[PDB]
């Protein structure tokens, strides 16, 4: 089975009569009941609850200094408000891009997360040698990061339980990146996934995201994504409790060149080492500030009907 799942927020176009009903009905994609953006087969919910995050510290900043309780009861809220039906049965998304659960790979943008960590640890333990600090600082984060991304994925799951379950973008791959410019993932993230079965084995479905890069060649937009398809089905076949279902994240904008549609090479050479790598089918994402006027609307219907849906139809 291939399931191709419709998540962009085409919701928005319908105050102009544009009801989006061709995904369905002609290019096969599934589609939530009356096009709505979180039904029955799909809903994504953005940066839910209050996981600690630096933004000023929000909820402590670095998970460790988080009020988990705090986050749980507040994300409780935005679940039962997002996805009022107990039974949903579809494709359960948590959004949640604040930091990696691996001290380690919160680089670049993210290091003010690692720098915090150690900063705590030495305000409170002036006297203990570096190494401790450090040791410390990786410890206590990676500790509370798996503890609130753990525990959310499981009061997900209990509270929708027809669900499949997981998280955007994990697992994630680092492929032509500085330090790693071949379209293979980084060795050290792919050893820090196979560790992370306290991820990976409750999640449901593996939600890998595959955006191209306008700053690549053709050959490297297909590399991205099938070094980053590779890293999930090898976690999706390693979990020893289950068989994950794995659904790349899509996007039909460049990711450097946000205001850029794909082109059609790119839609054909990358959708078809999706498929070809026996992924269980895809998510095409659009976000809410491309499609937020009628214009904006008709030219997305026009891309739609000249170039993303032919592709994905075949």
């Known amino acids: 089975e291939f399931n191709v799942y419709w998540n962009v927020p085409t919701f928005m176009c319908h105050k102009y009569g544009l009801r989006f009903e061709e995904v369905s009905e002609k290019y096969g994609i599934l589609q939530n009941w009356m096009d709505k953006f979180r039904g029955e087969e ?4 953005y940066d839910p609850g209050m996981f600690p995050a630096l933004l000023v510290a929000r909820n402590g900043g670095v998970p460790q200094l988080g009020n988990l309780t705090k986050h749980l009861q ?58 401790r600090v450090e040791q410390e600082a990786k410890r206590r984060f990676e500790k509370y990061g798996q503890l609130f991304m753990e525990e959310t994925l499981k009061a997900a799951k209990r509270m929708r339980p027809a669900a499949n379950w997981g998280y955007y973008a994990y697992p994630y791959c680092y492929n032509l990146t500085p330090n790693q410019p071949s379209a293979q993932c980084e ?28 700053n690549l060649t053709s050959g490297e937009r297909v590399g991205l994504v099938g070094g980053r398809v590779k890293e999930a089905l090898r976690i999706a076949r390693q979990m020893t409790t289950s068989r994950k279902k794995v659904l790349p994240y899509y996007w039909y904008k460049y990711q450097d060149r946000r205001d850029t549609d794909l082109s059609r090479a790119d839609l054909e050479a990358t959708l078809r080492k999706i498929t070809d790598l026996g992924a269980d089918g895809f998510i095409i994402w659009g976000s809410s500030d491309d499609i937020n006027t009628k214009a904006k609307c008709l030219q997305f219907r026009e891309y739609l009907n000249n170039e993303l849906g032919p592709a994905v139809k075949r």
């Open 74 to 131: 507040v994300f409780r809220d935005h679940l039962i408000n997002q996805i009022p039906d107990k039974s949903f049965p579809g494709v359960g998304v948590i959004d949640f891009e604040s930091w990696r659960p691996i001290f380690r790979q919160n680089w670049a943008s993210l290091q003010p997360y690692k720098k915090l960590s150690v900063e705590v640890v030495r305000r409170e333990h002036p006297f203990w040698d570096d190494q």
């Open 187 to 214: 060795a050290t993230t792919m050893q820090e996934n196979d560790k992370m079965s306290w991820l990976f084995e409750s999640e449901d479905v593996l939600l890998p995201s595959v955006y191209l890069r306008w």
């Open 42 to 45: 799909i809903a994504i919910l």
